[PDB]
Amino acid sequence: LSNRAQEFNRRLTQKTDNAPWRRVVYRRVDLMEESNAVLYYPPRPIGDRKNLFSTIFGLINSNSLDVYEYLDGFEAFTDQYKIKFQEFLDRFGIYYQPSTNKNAELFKVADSDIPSAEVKAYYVKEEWYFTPTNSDVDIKIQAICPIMTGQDEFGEVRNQPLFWIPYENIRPYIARERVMLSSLNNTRNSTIDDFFRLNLYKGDIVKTENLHNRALAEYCPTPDSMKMESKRIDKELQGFRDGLFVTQDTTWMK
Template sequence: MKKTFISFIFFALSLAAIFAQEAVRERITQSRENQSGKASVGLSVRAAQMNRTQSTDIEDAKWSREIYRYLDLSKEGNAPLYYPVMPEQGRMNLFTMIFKLLSENKIAAYEYLDGREVFTHEYRIDFNEFLDRFGIFYETRNGEIVVNDVDIPSHEVQGYYLKEAYYFETGTSNYGVKTVAVCPVIHRQGDYEANTVRYPLFWIPYDELRPYALRMPIMTSSLNNTMTATIDDFFRKNNYDGEIYKTTNLRNLAISQYTSSPEEMKAEQEKIEQQLKDFETRLWKENNDSTSVQPAQQNRRARRNIFRTSSSNSSNTMRDRRY
């Protein structure tokens, strides 16, 4: 009787161990399936790798310079950001994508402040208030805001302010340009104004946009209609055509504030562009001729040769020089 009871206990313990192993296997399998499902709707391996590469923390760089540009969408080089104006066949322009992401609360946008950007909760815009401020028509359905594609003012967004950072890391010898933030600029004519006025809408940190920009295809050429590039490629490769209107400086002044004429402003913009090019050129410039001798070294060697020659021609010895 005792042996039968002991055998029953061993049998029960074996079944428990088997069920525990199966439960562990099921959890592992389920976890793998979940990860696989996330990967299928998320970023590809290449996209994730590019995202990590572009997430460089410029605060750790030993040298950096922040540049502000204005991207005029009427220029041919910036056309991929503007077309198509209306969504068609799954394609949309950059502002339409930004607008839809904001309406779905997937990204955050921050107030455009005069001369600075503050990405804190205090300055995060309220989407409802933004719609009312710029007179964008919307409907409320089941407690959710709905804006039809035709009411999205993407045709009025004819420019972007772009903040970029040129940086160099001495530890990795990595030099690059990082897009820091973008600001859509809407062009509207006021009730009592004859000229079109620029209205900056809001700043968006580009790191929040990048996961979506990586998956948004664009057409970059009228000669090649295959959409082989993405919005992120456009920014990462600096394919845009933008003029500098400001650099980060101690007085926090735009170029127009310390220049007195369009010609002077143009000269200042060209000077800044040349400074950036010169820095990169000096950074990688090296002397490949190992046999060349610097002028200072030549002078030292010449002096040593003269001393040796004079010493060999002299008849005085150290003994003769003693007092």
């Protein structure tokens, strides 16, 4: 990147430092739904056509991405929780054979065995914040967690999360390649970075940064209960923005 580009990107960074209002919510973007399949378009890498999980797997295979383990309950991004790639492939059952390392690729994984088409959903940690300098609500992506929609035979769909990816680590490598956002207009005009920045992803809230560290699953037995709770949280997040501004009030015309 040229220094001009670096300065531009530094200007295009959301600073949630002195925000008077923050709200951290976790989504469960299902890739098997339109408007979220952009992250699944190529289930298996096709030449220069790759989905997010394939790109991420290649990046970790080249020591170019710092991803952290999915710890049930919390998301500490520290050097302690950096994942071990060989352990990840072994513990999740990925057959790999080590090729010539050449300091480029740690382990040679066949594309047929890359679990790129089973990751059918993503945990997206997004942080709604109120900008202290111009009073504007904005969403800042914190991390994305690829969850492999695996099958446990007896346990059917397992949906075990793989790891946690800080968004600033993956942002440089997803801000370049172009993807098509719709199946009606197939123009590769925008990037996945634009998909995440414009919040074009559609997902149900599965957890909020609660004071008891409680997830929706704990106090919602059935999927419909989780659906209605997610709708409630969305309504309250929207109600915050609605109550901020008072140009829609007509109580004065009385």
